[PDB]
Amino acid sequence: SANNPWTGFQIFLSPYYANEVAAAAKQITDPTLSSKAASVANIPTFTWLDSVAKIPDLGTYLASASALGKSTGTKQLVQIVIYDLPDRDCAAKASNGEFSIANNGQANYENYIDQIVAQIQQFPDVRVVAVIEPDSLANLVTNLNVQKCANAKTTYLACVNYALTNLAKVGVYMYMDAGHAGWLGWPANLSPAAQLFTQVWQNAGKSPFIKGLATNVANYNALQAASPDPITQGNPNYDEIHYINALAPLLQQAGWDATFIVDQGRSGVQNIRQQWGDWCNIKGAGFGTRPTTNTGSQFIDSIVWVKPGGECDGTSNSSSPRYDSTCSLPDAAQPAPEAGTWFQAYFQTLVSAANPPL
Ligand SMILES: OC[C@H]1O[C@@H](O)[C@H](O)[C@@H](O)[C@@H]1O
Ligand SMILES: [Cl-]
Ligand code: NA
Numbered sequence: 001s002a003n004n005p006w007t008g009f010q011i012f013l014s015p016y017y018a019n020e021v022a023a024a025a026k027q028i029t030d031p032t033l034s035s036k037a038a039s040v041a042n043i044p045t046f047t048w049l050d051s052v053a054k055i056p057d058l059g060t061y062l063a064s065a066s067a068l069g070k071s072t073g074t075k076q077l078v079q080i081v082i083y084d085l086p087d088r089d090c091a092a093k094a095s096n097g098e099f100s101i102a103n104n105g106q107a108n109y110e111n112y113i114d115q116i117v118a119q120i121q122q123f124p125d126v127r128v129v130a131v132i133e134p135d136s137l138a139n140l141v142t143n144l145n146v147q148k149c150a151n152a153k154t155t156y157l158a159c160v161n162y163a164l165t166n167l168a169k170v171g172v173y174m175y176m177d178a179g180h181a182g183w184l185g186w187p188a189n190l191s192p193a194a195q196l197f198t199q200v201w202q203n204a205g206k207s208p209f210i211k212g213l214a215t216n217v218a219n220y221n222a223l224q225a226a227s228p229d230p231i232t233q234g235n236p237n238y239d240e241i242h243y244i245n246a247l248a249p250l251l252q253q254a255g256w257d258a259t260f261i262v263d264q265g266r267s268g269v270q271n272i273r274q275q276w277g278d279w280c281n282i283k284g285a286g287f288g289t290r291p292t293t294n295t296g297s298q299f300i301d302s303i304v305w306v307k308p309g310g311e312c313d314g315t316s317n318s319s320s321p322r323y324d325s326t327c328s329l330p331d332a333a334q335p336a337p338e339a340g341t342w343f344q345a346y347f348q349t350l351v352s353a354a355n356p357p358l
Contacts, residue, residue: 094314138179185243286353
């Protein structure tokens with residue numbers, strides 16, 4: 001498309017991740033891995049609004065970006081993830097969140113969106129790019145037999161619609177999460193996915209701020225694999241560019257020339273999983289291609305780092321209410337702390353295994 005949200009902007013670096021990385025780098029005991037680890041804080045990432053408590057930090061990021069832009073004569077761009085649906089993470093245990101459908105979840109969620117909108121409205125010289133609700137829509141394509149997801153469907157659609165509709169009013173550029181090649185990229189899932197994304201786009205009034213879709217968020221797939229990972233057997237769409245190339249024409253037929261962003265923050269090391277569905281703290285992952293608008297594809301606006309590597313995907317402790325057996329598989333790094341908390345050993349391996357190297 002003509003308007004790539006990133007062109008002409010300088011990305012505001014996540015202060016949240018910067019603080020995690022600075023603390024982590026000081027604990028890496030070779031001075032050269034430590035300098036490479038510290039350099040990660042200069043790589044743009046998405047900051048997750050995974051609880052309502054963080055909304056005031058969004059406010060600080062916007063105001064800090066505005067001042068940095070003025071001090072430098074640049075236009076600044078803040079990257080966020082909207083991730084607080086009620087009955088969040090409906091097909092897994094590790095990332096259940098603060099809101100529940102049974103306890104006013106939708107009303108709570110819409111209040112969370114209102115508070116985000118109210119922050120963004122105050123800083124019109126800062127651009128915002130938001131990834132909308134990782135996993136939610138993909139779960140509504142393949143996981144309607146999961147009763148928690150079935151029972152969540154109407155609420156998820158309402159909440160996502162509220163987010164899209166209201167963030168559009170403050171000019172936020174949005175990419176709705178769309179799973180990954182091993183999830184929605186199976187040829188047989190492409191059309192049900194496109195049909196859902198089309199519905200969602202229509203219900204939010206087709207705002208031009210809804211740019212398209214995000215893929216591979218918090219996953220590990222290649223964008224363009226040298227050879228298919230053996231986990232992909234049976235699926236000709238073995239990497240994200242095959243998935244996107246196959247999905248985008250369906251969206252175009254349905255009236256929407258969508259564009260895409262692709263997470264590569266934990267994609268540096270391929271062929272490290274037993275099964276494709278192994279998503280949790282996959283051992284040996286490395287930082288992948290750095291964010292760039294040099295994407296290799298007409299459909300892809302940017303390679304991005306959405307999941308911030310080093311932040312855990314889920315606990316391996318089976319005494320936790322958030323224990324998911326995926327997080328104690330043989331290819332899952334163990335022991336692992338709660339999802340969203342820092343996992344130092346995992347970060348250092350991401351640094352050592354980075355490809356391209358840091
Ligand atoms: O690290 C990014 C996000 O990862 C998710 O798996 C966690 O549930 C969130 O708490 C965190 O914000
Ligand atoms: Cl079930
Ligand atoms: Na997750």
